[PDB]
Amino acid sequence: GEVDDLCELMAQLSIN
Amino acid sequence: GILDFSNDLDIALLDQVVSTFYQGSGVQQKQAQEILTKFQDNPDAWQKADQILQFSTNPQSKFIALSILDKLITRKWKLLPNDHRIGIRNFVVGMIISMCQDDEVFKTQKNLINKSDLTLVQILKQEWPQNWPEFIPELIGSSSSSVNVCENNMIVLKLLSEEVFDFSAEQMTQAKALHLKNSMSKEFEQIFKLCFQVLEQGSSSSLIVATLESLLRYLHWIPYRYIYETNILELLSTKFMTSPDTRAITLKCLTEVSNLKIPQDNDLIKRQTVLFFQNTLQQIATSVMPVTADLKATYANANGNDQSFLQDLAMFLTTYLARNRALLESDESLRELLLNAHQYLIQLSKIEERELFKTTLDYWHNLVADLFYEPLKKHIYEEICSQLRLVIIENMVRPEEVLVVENDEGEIVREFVKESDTIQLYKSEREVLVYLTHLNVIDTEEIMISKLARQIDGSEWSWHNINTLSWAIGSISGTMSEDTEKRFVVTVIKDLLDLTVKKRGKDNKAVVASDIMYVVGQYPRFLKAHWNFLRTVILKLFEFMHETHEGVQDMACDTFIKIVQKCKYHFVIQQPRESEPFIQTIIRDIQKTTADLQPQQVHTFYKACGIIISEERSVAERNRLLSDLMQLPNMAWDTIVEQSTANPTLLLDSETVKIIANIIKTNVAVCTSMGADFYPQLGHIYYNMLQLYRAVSSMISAQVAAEGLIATKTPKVRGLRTIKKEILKLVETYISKARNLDDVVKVLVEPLLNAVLEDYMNNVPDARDAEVLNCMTTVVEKVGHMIPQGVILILQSVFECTLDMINKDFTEYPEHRVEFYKLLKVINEKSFAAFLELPPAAFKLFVDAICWAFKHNNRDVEVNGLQIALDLVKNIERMGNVPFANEFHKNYFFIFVSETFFVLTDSDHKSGFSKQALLLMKLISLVYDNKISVPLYQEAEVPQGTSNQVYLSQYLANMLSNAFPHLTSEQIASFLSALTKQYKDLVVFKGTLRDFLVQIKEVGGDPTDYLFAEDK
Amino acid sequence: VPTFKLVLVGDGGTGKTTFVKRHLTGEFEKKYIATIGVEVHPLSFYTNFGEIKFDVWDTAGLEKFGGLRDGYYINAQCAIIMFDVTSRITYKNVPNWHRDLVRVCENIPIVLCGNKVDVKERKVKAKTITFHRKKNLQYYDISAKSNYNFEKPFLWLARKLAGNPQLEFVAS
Ligand SMILES: Nc1nc2c(ncn2[C@@H]2O[C@H](COP(=O)(O)OP(=O)(O)OP(=O)(O)O)[C@@H](O)[C@H]2O)c(=O)[nH]1
Ligand SMILES: [Mg+2]
């Protein structure tokens, strides 16, 4: 779960 | 006229010229400078010095007079009769005294006084003690006569110690240096007495400071007994640490004390070592500042003296601790002292001054290494270590730096800085913090999570703070267990992502995101263990590659290539959950991904893909991946080669030149990453590329011939040269990295040579690119052993014309000079056979070219020239009693001996000394080992059967007498005897040469000096 | 606007002349034209506190072109000792220049500069350059070719001579 959740958060990383 | 190079001297006019030069400006000052230089260089100028020293109203004029005197003393002292010598000597002592009696001059003209004193010290070297045995007694006696004379005596003694112990090597013959060292050691009891009396009775003043200045220089050589068996330790560590005016110099002295050669099994000396340190620390605590003092703020607001002091303090602690930490550790009563001293460093480590921090950090590294390998003492420094951790984490510097440069073609190129001060500082800090993490993982993690939490709540938020913290987190990569590392990285990345969401502004988000990428790039193990994450990161980077925000794209490309460098395997393999190696996915969308990137960023992207592709080990699949990757540039290359072949005018189109440059640059990028594996692609574009080379080179050369050098700066020629250089760069890149050397020799070499060699010959000088020579150097390095005829062609094409370019002076075409001799060198190494086959006239030109490199006041050229000479001689040595070797010796042995001596004895060729000596040894060896089987003389000029030894000796004696008529027969004879007895010992031979080099600069040198080595 | 004398000393071909020339004009000279004696170059810098001038006394580092040698150093208010990081001997001679310099100029700010840090094959490594520590000299890695830490020596000297750590270099 925790790595996968990290992946999701990483994917959402935005500069706007 | 301001010319004073006549018969009668105008002191006023000289003062005018001097004043014009020193206080004037511009063309007047220029003329005054040339005049003063010409006057100062007059062999007879010294005759006027005394007059100046007595009549000149200008301190600078006196300075210049002392300079001229310095010249006389150093070079022609022993020509003067003893009477005159004493006369000048007493003139200088008297003048020194006069100046000292003048309080204003003494305090306001330290420069002139120091010059005077140094002039005296020069006379001391030349005279004392053999001809001036009473000098030290008289000096000590005169100390009482005036306070200024006492102080000046301390300056003179400091200077004498410097000249004898600090700067004696390469200024004096080994024999004379020993003589002066022995002379100064013999009379040091008295000198130390004067010193100690002044220190013990005197109170803080200029004279005390001067005395301590002298003591600093004495400490380099004096026996420890003057320090430990006298009360001077107590004086320094207590008395002179309380007085502000002496603190700094006393610390310097104590720093040197800490470094003395002392007995290692003397318990009293151990206690004394501890004691002075305890005194110094307690005295700093009482008089200067406590351990609790904020040295960061103090240094920031300090006055420079205080700054220097703080620096000196760190130097003191770091020196003493590095030597005597064990001493402080063994006895538990000393615990409080030990920690206190370390605490000072901690405070000193917090000072924002890079050089001071580095000084502290060296020691820190020492301490943490020792603790790592001896964890028994670890507990003692637990608290110190904890603070040090924070210090380092807070003061991490940028791990890599980038420069934006303009090349000779006008391109704006982003280059990564390598091996810089900042990078070495990063590496040092990393090692220290890695040690610290090993020592206590729990503490390091807690501190880093705390800094991070303080970043999140915004309490310690700043770009610099978050960058520093990130660098720190990244620095300790690979220290924790993979499980601990997993949890740590998860936390850090998650927090940083939440921070990015919380931060407002595109600026702030960009900063934090770039930090996230840096951190992830720093933990390749985490990426390898979790494919989904790696993919998400890579895609996010791709997404970033379309972001126009300044710096983001470079960050994304840098991260991408960094991540692939470490994680390449995970791109070439099919990670279950993926239907294809991710490299295929990257290559598929490469157009879309790299659409918004700058050209150079695109090149980096291709370079990354190349790194990945070279991981695929199946040649078929790798070649396909390479082909797929290169498709776009390949296709534009195809359409362009067709149009160029058909229409030559296309190369006039700047848009085409651009496209061509980018194509070759992309090839260069991929070839860089892929090395031998790139050969298919090279073969795909090779022959056409060489043709395009010929075209662009012809165009450059034509336009330069027509228009002149200025043409080389025109945008058109700049673009064309880019294409030329990139083509050369690709070829050199592949050949350097190549594995399959057959293919290089049989497929690549011949086309390349045909394309570039004839072009280079036929180019006008101002159009020839040195990169051609460089390419040839790399070709020869790699496969020259396999292409004798190729090498011969390289020589025939480049040798005579490059030589003719660079044999007019030492200044024109510098790059050409460097690369010419690099190529000559490598040819001489790899394919010496080429030089064998040259006609006699060509070989002569070769030798002339080697000796030309000798005379170069350019290190790059000179070292290569000397190496070529050595290698050539080695090569010819390999051939036995063969007519070529014999003839070569008959023709060039003496040329090489004389040329080597010329550059040895030349003022400005010291860089080549190490090499020069070697060559000289070898040459002498060839005669004195009887390895030359034919007489080197002629005409029976020396009686038949004369040994080559005797003839070499005669030739050398005659040549040295001609070059240096001021040397005696005995000087020359002895030097040559020493050389001929010492040609098997490198260090002794070098010594003898240095002795000779000292003796040729002066008149009346001692012939015995050459027995120095034989004496010890 | 204040004018301070800056003596630039170092071995031959360490990149002193090129350094000053690029500060003056912005051009990097590829050729090695050895200085003869000294050339005095008025070099100006613009700062948030005003203009600062340096009489840069670019001195010859070759023995045969030494001229007045230490004579050039009189009344200097600051100094740069330059060596070449690609040549060990140029750092070897740093003590000798320092010695010559401080014997004329007792208490002046001095910057030791390792030039040519751009060259790949760096012979004098960062960790090796420690001489400046005991002589309380500033040190900077510089490159006249690369414009690396190009303004840092002068920025430090300006801050010292003005006694203002807040001094920043600005555009004309
Ligand atoms: N790689 C590299 N080469 C440089 C750099 N700066 C200068 N050079 C080269 O090194 C040489 C130094 O020449 P100058 O700067 O005129 O000489 P100098 O240091 O004053 O030496 P003298 O005049 O003899 O005292 C030139 O040929 C420059 O092109 C640099 O930053 N990097
Ligand atoms: Mg110069």
Side-chain angles (χ1 to χ4, degrees):
Chain A
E2 283 199 41
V3 193
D4 307 332
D5 299 338
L6 182 67
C7 286
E8 199 183 284
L9 263 154
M10 178 68 233
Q12 294 190 37
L13 168 64
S14 160
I15 188 206
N16 285 289
Chain B
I2 84 166
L3 331 190
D4 44 68
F5 327 77
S6 244
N7 346 267
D8 340 37
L9 174 54
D10 179 350
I11 304 288
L13 172 61
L14 167 60
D15 289 322
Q16 184 62 263
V17 176
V18 168
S19 209
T20 302
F21 165 62
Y22 276 103
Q23 279 83 53
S25 67
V27 73
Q28 259 159 347
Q29 168 172 70
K30 189 175 182 285
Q31 292 171 338
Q33 191 268 164
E34 278 137 21
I35 291 167
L36 264 175
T37 301
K38 280 214 207 59
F39 169 68
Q40 191 255 163
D41 278 333
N42 185 13
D44 297 7
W46 57 274
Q47 292 160 25
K48 298 186 178 288
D50 63 344
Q51 204 198 323
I52 306 162
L53 287 172
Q54 268 182 264
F55 290 1
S56 168
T57 57
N58 193 327
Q60 280 103 322
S61 297
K62 280 173 178 180
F63 193 109
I64 282 160
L66 284 167
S67 282
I68 309 170
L69 275 175
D70 271 340
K71 285 182 151 48
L72 163 73
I73 297 158
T74 47
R75 315 209 273 254
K76 304 201 219 145
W77 185 249
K78 284 168 189 120
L79 282 170
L80 296 171
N82 203 58
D83 290 8
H84 284 282
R85 206 175 290 132
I86 302 194
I88 287 155
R89 167 172 86 195
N90 292 317
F91 174 80
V92 169
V93 175
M95 180 189 74
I96 288 172
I97 294 164
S98 300
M99 284 167 32
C100 286
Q101 300 301 350
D102 190 324
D103 200 346
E104 183 186 18
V105 175
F106 189 85
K107 291 299 170 144
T108 65
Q109 282 173 36
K110 268 286 180 288
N111 50 25
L112 178 59
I113 286 173
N114 290 20
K115 191 52 173 180
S116 302
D117 292 329
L118 172 72
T119 306
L120 169 62
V121 181
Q122 290 310 141
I123 301 154
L124 286 169
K125 289 149 76 166
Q126 281 305 320
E127 285 289 285
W128 168 88
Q130 59 281 353
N131 206 34
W132 198 0
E134 282 320 290
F135 167 82
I136 298 291
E138 263 152 35
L139 183 141
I140 307 161
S142 72
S143 319
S144 47
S145 80
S146 169
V147 61
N148 292 348
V149 169
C150 196
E151 191 169 312
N152 189 70
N153 287 350
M154 293 308 171
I155 296 153
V156 167
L157 280 164
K158 181 185 57 93
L159 284 179
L160 179 74
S161 173
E162 280 165 356
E163 291 299 303
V164 171
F165 289 92
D166 289 338
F167 302 113
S168 68
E170 288 201 60
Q171 263 190 315
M172 280 172 217
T173 117
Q174 303 173 83
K176 178 157 168 221
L178 176 64
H179 169 75
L180 283 194
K181 285 178 209 201
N182 287 335
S183 285
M184 201 168 174
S185 189
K186 278 183 198 71
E187 292 177 70
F188 182 70
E189 201 69 72
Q190 34 247 79
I191 304 167
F192 178 82
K193 270 156 209 281
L194 163 56
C195 197
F196 191 83
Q197 202 275 331
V198 173
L199 284 187
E200 177 202 55
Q201 290 309 141
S203 292
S204 165
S205 68
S206 188
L207 164 73
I208 291 305
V209 164
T211 301
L212 288 174
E213 297 295 323
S214 70
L215 174 67
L216 191 53
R217 302 294 189 159
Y218 298 142
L219 274 161
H220 297 327
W221 62 273
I222 62 178
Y224 77 102
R225 68 172 164 103
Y226 291 80
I227 300 304
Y228 276 86
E229 295 193 352
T230 70
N231 204 59
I232 203 159
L233 267 194
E234 272 287 327
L235 273 180
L236 299 171
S237 59
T238 57
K239 180 198 207 296
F240 299 113
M241 286 306 295
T242 69
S243 48
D245 289 323
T246 59
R247 268 160 198 169
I249 179 69
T250 303
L251 259 186
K252 302 181 172 296
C253 281
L254 287 167
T255 294
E256 301 318 322
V257 163
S258 301
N259 271 329
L260 287 166
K261 184 194 266 72
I262 72 156
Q264 284 318 115
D265 289 348
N266 187 326
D267 288 17
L268 183 144
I269 289 166
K270 290 180 196 208
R271 290 147 184 58
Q272 273 187 285
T273 296
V274 165
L275 181 55
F276 84 84
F277 184 75
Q278 188 158 66
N279 287 335
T280 316
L281 265 292
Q282 167 66 354
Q283 199 56 253
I284 288 163
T286 313
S287 300
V288 183
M289 70 229 174
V291 291
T292 66
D294 189 0
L295 298 190
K296 187 185 172 76
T298 296
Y299 197 99
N301 294 285
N303 67 355
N305 305 78
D306 292 334
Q307 281 170 338
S308 299
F309 174 75
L310 285 175
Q311 274 160 28
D312 290 322
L313 181 48
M315 184 52 89
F316 174 67
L317 298 162
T318 59
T319 295
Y320 183 96
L321 287 185
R323 194 160 165 217
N324 296 309
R325 186 175 56 241
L327 273 184
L328 284 190
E329 266 161 357
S330 70
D331 174 20
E332 279 151 38
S333 60
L334 292 183
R335 191 64 63 85
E336 167 154 281
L337 177 76
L338 181 58
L339 303 185
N340 281 325
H342 284 91
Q343 188 68 32
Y344 271 109
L345 277 181
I346 291 283
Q347 294 309 96
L348 282 168
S349 289
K350 288 172 173 151
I351 285 176
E352 191 176 342
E353 172 75 63
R354 169 172 287 204
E355 293 316 317
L356 187 150
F357 181 79
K358 269 170 70 196
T359 302
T360 68
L361 186 75
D362 289 319
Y363 173 76
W364 285 134
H365 179 279
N366 179 358
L367 171 66
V368 293
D370 198 50
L371 289 196
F372 181 79
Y373 290 103
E374 277 183 50
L376 291 90
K377 301 181 291 179
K378 181 170 107 178
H379 74 281
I380 286 166
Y381 301 97
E382 273 200 335
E383 174 65 36
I384 287 302
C385 286
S386 191
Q387 299 169 83
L388 183 59
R389 279 186 195 94
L390 192 73
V391 166
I392 309 292
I393 290 169
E394 281 186 6
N395 302 123
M396 273 292 154
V397 292
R398 196 174 268 78
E400 61 268 11
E401 278 157 291
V402 282
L403 279 177
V404 172
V405 301
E406 188 186 297
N407 52 35
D408 325 311
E409 285 67 51
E411 308 191 281
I412 301 320
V413 182
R414 185 158 177 277
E415 71 127 81
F416 267 93
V417 189
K418 284 285 206 146
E419 274 164 20
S420 66
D421 198 55
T422 311
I423 295 155
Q424 188 60 269
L425 174 52
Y426 170 79
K427 284 181 183 185
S428 276
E429 289 186 305
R430 191 232 174 222
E431 273 167 12
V432 162
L433 187 59
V434 157
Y435 275 133
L436 279 170
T437 306
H438 280 296
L439 292 174
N440 190 334
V441 180
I442 298 88
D443 191 44
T444 312
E445 182 181 335
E446 294 187 343
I447 292 172
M448 280 164 178
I449 306 294
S450 282
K451 300 290 287 175
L452 194 56
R454 266 175 282 138
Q455 282 299 303
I456 293 170
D457 57 30
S459 71
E460 284 180 354
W461 158 259
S462 87
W463 293 348
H464 168 277
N465 292 335
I466 192 47
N467 289 339
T468 302
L469 177 58
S470 295
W471 299 329
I473 287 156
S475 57
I476 64 163
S477 180
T479 62
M480 308 169 168
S481 70
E482 202 188 5
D483 276 0
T484 306
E485 196 202 53
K486 185 179 144 291
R487 270 71 157 186
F488 176 66
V489 161
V490 163
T491 292
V492 167
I493 299 307
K494 179 179 174 46
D495 285 351
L496 279 180
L497 288 162
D498 201 34
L499 177 58
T500 309
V501 297
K502 275 192 304 298
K503 287 319 288 168
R504 283 204 189 76
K506 205 194 196 65
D507 269 314
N508 292 314
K509 288 172 180 289
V511 159
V512 185
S514 314
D515 281 333
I516 293 167
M517 289 314 189
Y518 173 76
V519 170
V520 296
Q522 273 302 105
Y523 283 93
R525 187 165 50 160
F526 181 69
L527 296 183
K528 290 194 219 168
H530 308 83
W531 163 252
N532 57 353
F533 189 68
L534 186 43
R535 193 172 167 275
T536 314
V537 164
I538 301 297
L539 290 195
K540 183 61 54 174
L541 282 179
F542 289 173
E543 173 175 349
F544 276 142
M545 284 170 178
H546 312 120
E547 175 60 54
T548 44
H549 192 85
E550 213 271 314
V552 172
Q553 268 161 329
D554 278 313
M555 172 271 295
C557 286
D558 289 332
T559 316
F560 175 53
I561 190 168
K562 190 147 157 213
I563 291 175
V564 302
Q565 193 37 85
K566 290 283 145 153
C567 298
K568 40 191 173 193
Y569 177 84
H570 289 273
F571 292 96
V572 290
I573 69 145
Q574 220 203 259
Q575 311 252 24
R577 215 179 152 288
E578 308 277 343
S579 34
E580 51 175 0
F582 195 67
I583 179 55
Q584 280 175 53
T585 317
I586 294 179
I587 296 179
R588 189 144 47 247
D589 303 320
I590 191 162
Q591 182 141 28
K592 189 182 45 158
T593 304
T594 62
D596 299 307
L597 291 181
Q598 282 314 109
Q600 191 188 351
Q601 305 171 335
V602 176
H603 305 141
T604 295
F605 193 105
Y606 277 68
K607 200 181 146 171
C609 289
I611 284 149
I612 301 186
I613 287 154
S614 287
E615 210 42 46
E616 176 63 62
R617 276 301 94 203
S618 154
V619 56
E621 175 70 40
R622 169 180 68 256
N623 287 345
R624 208 250 300 125
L625 283 169
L626 169 58
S627 165
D628 281 351
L629 171 73
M630 290 314 266
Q631 208 196 60
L632 305 84
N634 270 346
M635 278 175 133
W637 171 258
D638 278 326
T639 63
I640 211 50
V641 160
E642 190 156 81
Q643 292 187 245
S644 295
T645 300
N647 192 346
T649 291
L650 264 303
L651 293 185
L652 247 65
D653 185 35
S654 64
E655 216 59 27
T656 298
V657 173
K658 170 168 173 291
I659 299 162
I660 291 185
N662 282 352
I663 292 169
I664 307 289
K665 278 163 167 273
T666 304
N667 277 258
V668 162
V670 177
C671 189
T672 294
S673 35
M674 288 201 65
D677 290 344
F678 182 81
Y679 176 71
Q681 179 66 18
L682 177 75
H684 188 90
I685 65 156
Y686 193 64
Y687 189 72
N688 288 333
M689 180 185 66
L690 285 189
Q691 298 321 88
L692 176 77
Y693 175 100
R694 290 165 117 153
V696 301
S697 198
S698 277
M699 287 174 64
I700 284 158
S701 191
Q703 184 178 353
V704 164
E707 290 178 1
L709 182 69
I710 181 73
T712 61
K713 281 191 208 184
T714 66
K716 163 182 181 175
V717 172
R718 280 187 294 111
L720 283 183
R721 187 171 54 246
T722 304
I723 292 176
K724 207 187 163 182
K725 279 171 184 193
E726 288 299 322
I727 289 159
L728 284 176
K729 205 187 287 187
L730 177 62
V731 171
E732 177 273 309
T733 306
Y734 171 81
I735 293 174
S736 70
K737 306 193 171 308
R739 273 179 193 276
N740 189 329
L741 290 197
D742 271 312
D743 285 356
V744 173
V745 162
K746 283 151 173 178
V747 172
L748 300 185
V749 162
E750 173 140 347
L752 171 72
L753 291 196
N754 295 348
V756 305
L757 287 189
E758 191 142 336
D759 171 75
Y760 177 94
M761 282 194 278
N762 290 333
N763 277 356
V764 294
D766 276 341
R768 293 188 184 110
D769 282 318
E771 284 83 357
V772 177
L773 288 174
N774 208 340
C775 185
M776 288 314 103
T777 300
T778 304
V779 161
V780 171
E781 162 70 40
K782 279 297 292 199
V783 290
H785 58 295
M786 284 160 90
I787 55 158
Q789 280 307 312
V791 165
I792 298 166
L793 257 171
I794 288 160
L795 269 185
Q796 280 169 11
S797 297
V798 309
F799 178 65
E800 301 219 28
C801 61
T802 309
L803 182 53
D804 203 18
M805 271 163 84
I806 66 160
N807 67 353
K808 300 311 178 266
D809 47 44
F810 297 109
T811 77
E812 290 306 305
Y813 304 114
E815 327 216 63
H816 287 85
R817 282 165 204 289
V818 175
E819 301 274 3
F820 179 57
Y821 287 114
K822 283 204 267 199
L823 173 69
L824 274 173
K825 177 172 93 86
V826 66
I827 285 162
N828 183 257
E829 298 169 321
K830 299 290 187 169
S831 191
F832 162 71
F835 291 115
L836 283 172
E837 294 169 59
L838 290 189
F843 198 82
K844 178 137 166 186
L845 270 188
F846 180 41
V847 164
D848 291 323
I850 299 161
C851 301
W852 182 246
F854 280 5
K855 300 185 178 68
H856 268 74
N857 300 106
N858 177 327
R859 282 169 297 274
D860 294 324
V861 170
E862 188 189 332
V863 288
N864 274 325
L866 281 162
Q867 198 55 61
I868 296 160
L870 261 169
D871 287 341
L872 171 62
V873 169
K874 281 183 163 136
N875 283 328
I876 289 173
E877 169 178 23
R878 266 189 267 287
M879 333 182 345
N881 191 13
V882 167
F884 184 93
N886 296 337
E887 288 300 304
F888 160 82
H889 285 131
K890 281 170 154 179
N891 294 316
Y892 303 110
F893 175 80
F894 282 118
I895 289 178
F896 272 113
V897 165
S898 67
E899 286 300 333
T900 310
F901 262 103
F902 172 79
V903 290
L904 265 173
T905 63
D906 184 285
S907 39
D908 289 293
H909 280 118
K910 297 284 191 292
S911 307
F913 176 80
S914 205
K915 268 164 192 56
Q916 291 161 358
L918 270 178
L919 178 54
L920 206 52
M921 287 176 72
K922 185 58 77 159
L923 293 167
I924 291 165
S925 87
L926 286 176
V927 168
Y928 279 85
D929 286 334
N930 283 106
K931 294 193 56 87
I932 294 171
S933 38
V934 70
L936 288 163
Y937 45 90
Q938 206 235 316
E939 188 228 43
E941 62 191 308
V942 248
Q944 185 276 318
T946 277
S947 81
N948 272 335
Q949 287 88 346
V950 304
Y951 182 64
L952 174 54
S953 288
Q954 270 189 10
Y955 175 102
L956 279 184
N958 171 75
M959 170 195 40
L960 285 173
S961 313
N962 289 352
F964 305 108
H966 56 274
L967 300 179
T968 59
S969 308
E970 285 79 28
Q971 262 176 299
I972 282 156
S974 184
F975 158 69
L976 283 176
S977 182
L979 272 196
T980 68
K981 284 181 180 60
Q982 292 165 353
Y983 63 84
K984 297 202 188 216
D985 193 325
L986 177 71
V987 181
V988 168
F989 194 95
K990 287 174 62 170
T992 310
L993 284 185
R994 285 210 204 73
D995 292 342
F996 184 68
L997 287 202
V998 162
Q999 281 206 355
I1000 52 168
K1001 284 182 279 166
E1002 81 196 351
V1003 179
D1006 199 336
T1008 68
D1009 294 348
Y1010 305 112
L1011 319 171
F1012 172 79
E1014 211 202 41
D1015 282 344
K1016 184 174 304 194
Chain C
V1 302
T3 313
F4 299 98
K5 170 171 177 165
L6 171 67
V7 159
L8 174 50
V9 290
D11 268 0
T14 52
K16 307 186 293 291
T17 310
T18 54
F19 188 61
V20 184
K21 286 292 210 256
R22 191 181 201 217
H23 266 285
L24 275 172
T25 75
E27 297 198 335
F28 168 76
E29 178 71 58
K30 274 178 219 164
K31 288 163 184 194
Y32 175 36
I33 306 167
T35 307
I36 305 159
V38 71
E39 272 156 52
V40 187
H41 299 291
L43 184 55
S44 301
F45 291 74
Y46 295 77
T47 70
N48 49 1
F49 283 84
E51 189 190 340
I52 184 179
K53 290 193 192 279
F54 286 87
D55 272 316
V56 173
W57 288 55
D58 175 27
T59 63
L62 286 181
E63 189 151 311
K64 67 190 194 197
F65 291 150
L68 298 193
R69 312 279 295 112
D70 54 315
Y72 299 128
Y73 305 167
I74 305 172
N75 298 144
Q77 291 147 278
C78 58
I80 296 166
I81 307 165
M82 199 173 292
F83 70 106
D84 181 349
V85 298
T86 74
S87 174
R88 287 200 206 81
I89 195 181
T90 65
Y91 181 64
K92 159 161 181 159
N93 291 314
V94 159
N96 306 339
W97 295 104
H98 176 261
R99 161 204 71 221
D100 285 346
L101 170 65
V102 301
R103 282 182 186 179
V104 180
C105 305
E106 283 222 45
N107 209 40
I108 62 164
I110 296 160
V111 187
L112 177 66
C113 294
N115 199 35
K116 309 195 190 174
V117 289
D118 50 32
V119 175
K120 158 216 200 148
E121 268 328 316
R122 186 197 183 145
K123 295 281 157 44
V124 185
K125 300 289 186 178
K127 188 189 191 303
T128 298
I129 301 144
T130 51
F131 171 84
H132 58 296
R133 278 159 180 196
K134 271 164 197 218
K135 313 299 203 158
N136 318 93
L137 313 176
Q138 192 44 287
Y139 178 73
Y140 288 124
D141 265 353
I142 69 158
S143 184
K145 181 169 181 204
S146 271
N147 202 312
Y148 182 75
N149 284 312
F150 195 60
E151 291 197 347
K152 280 267 194 63
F154 291 102
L155 181 57
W156 191 78
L157 289 176
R159 284 168 173 178
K160 291 288 280 155
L161 292 168
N164 188 349
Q166 274 68 249
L167 187 140
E168 275 272 38
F169 276 156
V170 310
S172 196

